[PDB]
Amino acid sequence: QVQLVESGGGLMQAGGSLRLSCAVSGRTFSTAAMGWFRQAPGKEREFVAAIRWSGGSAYYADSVKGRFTISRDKAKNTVYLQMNSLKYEDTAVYYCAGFSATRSLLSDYATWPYDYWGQGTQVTVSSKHHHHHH
Amino acid sequence: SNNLDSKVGGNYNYLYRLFRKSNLKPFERDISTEIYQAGSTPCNGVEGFNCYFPLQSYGFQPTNGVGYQPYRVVVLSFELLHAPATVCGPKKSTNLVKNKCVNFNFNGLTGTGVLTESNKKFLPFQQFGRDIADTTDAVRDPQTL
Amino acid sequence: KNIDGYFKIYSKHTPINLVRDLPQGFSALEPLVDLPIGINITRFQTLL
Ligand SMILES: *[C@@H]1O[C@H](CO)[C@@H](O)[C@H](O)[C@H]1NC(C)=O
């Protein structure tokens, strides 16, 4: 009866910061993991970050490594995505995932099909480049 | 247990240990989740290169091969201590006959002999005596001390 | 003694007339208890 519910999406200028939250009810992901994925409109779903629930070790896509931080609070059964140094191209719908699978190798969570997802929260990055040329 | 332990999409609740620094001793139980140091670099509880989580899930789907299907296992170990035997079979007991050649069974201890009133002085804990030949020379009746 | 997760306790009570140390002589300890604990023990302490 488990639910993932995201919050924290919104409009930011490039170079700024956003924190997403995903609250879990129904269950824990004890020895397994939670993730963040994004989908830009008309683009294929993309892995962003994963965290092991027990140990808190993180795995990141190359596109976000060193700019995004994933963290989790076990007491609140919440995972967080700290989105620093936002870029036009980070613009997407972001959704949290649950994996019921405990994989020995953290990197597997980049490709493993998740069994749980939340609704998604829209992140929009504003620029001064004026990308949309007519 | 494919009917119970498998579900559409894969049941990953069941785990197995994939790495360990040594083999287990008989009836040893290791439940530790310490990050396995595959290499020379200490992990300090941080996963990465040569730093792996020791456990891994089973892929139990109803469509899986019988080889990969879930099986429930019970292992019964039988133990004879420095103590009375308290786990017995359903075998009915009988009346006791003395001063006759009989086929006796005390608590699974079988033999053939003549059972007589003894003048031995067993201690409150002592169940059965032995002879020099490591054969039973005297017993304590399980029903009567 | 704890062997294969079984904690065996043997004991003996004897009368004595000595304040210094252990009386010299010989006496056997009969078992009292066998607890099926399976608890690993490496240390202990006394309570008075
Ligand atoms: C059961 O065994 C005990 C031995 O202490 C004996 O006193 C008692 O009479 C026995 N009862 C029956 C129903 O055989």
| 3-state SS record for B64-119 | CCCCCCCCCCCCCCCCCCCCCCCCCCCCCCCCCCCCCEEEEEECCEEEEEECCCCC
Q: Is the Cβ–Cβ distance between C38 and C13 less than 8 Å? A: no
Tokens of B103: 């086929």
The continuous run of DSSP H or E covering A38 comes out as strand A33-39
The pair phi, psi for residue A106, each rounded to 5°, is -60, -35
d(CA B71, CA B75): 13
Q: Is the Cβ–Cβ distance between B114 and B100 less than 8 Å? A: yes
d(CA A26, CA A2): 4
Is the pair C, A in contact (3+ CB pairs within 8 Å)?
no
- State the residue for tokens 């924190």: A19
Q: Is the Cβ–Cβ distance between A35 and A99 less than 8 Å? A: yes
Helices marked H in A1-134: none
Ligand 1 geometric centre to CA of B145 (Å): 10
In sequence order, what are the beta bridge partners of B128? B139
Tokens of A46: 């993309």
Do B81 and C31 make contact, defined as CB atoms within 8 angstroms? no
In sequence order, what are the beta bridge partners of A121? A94
Contacts of A88 (CB under 8 A, 6+ apart): A14, A125, A126, A127, A129, A131
Angle (nearest 5°) at CA B92 between B91 and B95: 135
In sequence order, what are the beta bridge partners of A24? A4
Q: Is the Cβ–Cβ distance between B69 and B2 less than 8 Å? A: yes
Do A32 and B12 make contact, defined as CB atoms within 8 angstroms? yes
Q: Among residues A12, A3, A5, which one has the least CA distance to residue A84?
A: A12
Tokens of A26: 């129904």
Count of beta carbons in the 10 Å neighbourhood of residue A55: 18
Question: Which chain A positions have a beta carbon within 8 Å of B47's beta carbon?
Answer: 52, 55, 57, 106
Contacts of A74 (CB under 8 A, 6+ apart): A28, A53
Domain boundaries, chain A: 10-126
**Where does residue B5 rank: exposed (0-12), middle (13-18), buried (19+ CB within 10 A)?**
middle
Shortest CA distance from B51: residue in chain A: A105
* In CATH, A10-126 is 2.60.120.260: no
Do B46 and A102 make contact, defined as CB atoms within 8 angstroms? no
Question: A87-124: b or e for each residue (b if 16 or more CB lie within 10 Å)?
Answer: eeebbbbbbbbbbbbbbbebebbeebebebbbebbebe
Number of DSSP helices (H) and strands (E) in chain C, helices first: 0, 3
d(CA C37, CA A53): 33
Distance of CA A43 to the CA centre of its chain: 16
Q: Is the Cβ–Cβ distance between A22 and A4 less than 8 Å? A: yes
d(CA B56, CA B36): 12
In sequence order, what are the beta bridge partners of B37? B51
d(CA C16, CA C23): 8
- State the residue for tokens 């995004």: A68
Ligand 1 geometric centre to CA of B112 (Å): 25
Shortest CA distance from B25: residue in chain C: C4
Tokens of A9: 């999406």
Shortest CA distance from B83: residue in chain C: C34
* Nearest chain B CA: its distance from C2 CA (Å): 13
> Is residue B109 classed as helix, strand or coil in its secondary structure?
strand
CA A52 → CA A59, A99, C40, C47, distances in Å?
9, 10, 31, 45
Do C30 and B82 make contact, defined as CB atoms within 8 angstroms? no
* Nearest chain B CA: its distance from A124 CA (Å): 32
Q: What single letter denotes the amino acid at residue B21?
A: K
CA torsion sign for B117, B122, B126, B131 is negative
Window B:88-117, CB contacts with A under 8 Å: none
Q: What single letter denotes the amino acid at residue A86?
A: L
In sequence order, what are the beta bridge partners of A13? A126
d(CA C31, CA A21): 62
The pair phi, psi for residue A96, each rounded to 5°, is -80, 150
Ligand 1 geometric centre to CA of B80 (Å): 23
Is the Cβ of C31 closer than 8 Å to some Cβ of chain B? yes
The pair phi, psi for residue A127, each rounded to 5°, is -135, 170
- State the residue for tokens 């456990």: B55
Q: How many CA atoms lie within 13 A of C14 on its CB side?
A: 14
> Is residue B4 classed as helix, strand or coil in its secondary structure?
helix
Q: Which chains touch C (3 or more CB pairs under 8 A)?
A: B
Angle (nearest 5°) at CA B80 between B77 and B85: 110
d(CA A39, CA A109): 17
d(CA C2, CA B29): 18
Do B53 and A100 make contact, defined as CB atoms within 8 angstroms? no
Give the method of determination: cryo-EM
Is the pair A, B in contact (3+ CB pairs within 8 Å)?
yes
